[PDB]
User: Fold Single domain antibody SD83 from Lama glama.
Amino acid sequence: VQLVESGGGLVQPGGSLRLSCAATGFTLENKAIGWFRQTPGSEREGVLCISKSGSWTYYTDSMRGRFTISRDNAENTVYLQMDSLKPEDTAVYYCATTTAGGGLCWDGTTFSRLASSWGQGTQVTVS
Assistant:
């Protein structure tokens, strides 16, 4: 079982990107998927999580309206849309899911430490 990311890229400020988190081997409909960003030499930080029941938990307190999240069950994929991109958004982005924690988003530190599957990471650069 694995989580596969894509949709990264490099755009000017003001652009937008949509990241995807695709599951092979299991159905995301019953799980919570959380997104995190990291730059080398700094700790991961939560962005946004969608629970099994579909609630959105914002780990970040910055620019909440720019980040949106959706689940496509037909494709077994979760999407993170990022609008109005700024240079400070440049980072590697990861999705993650937990088997423990039972479909809840928790908070950012808890979810990241509990996570049992990680995406491979995708580069987002705003220049």
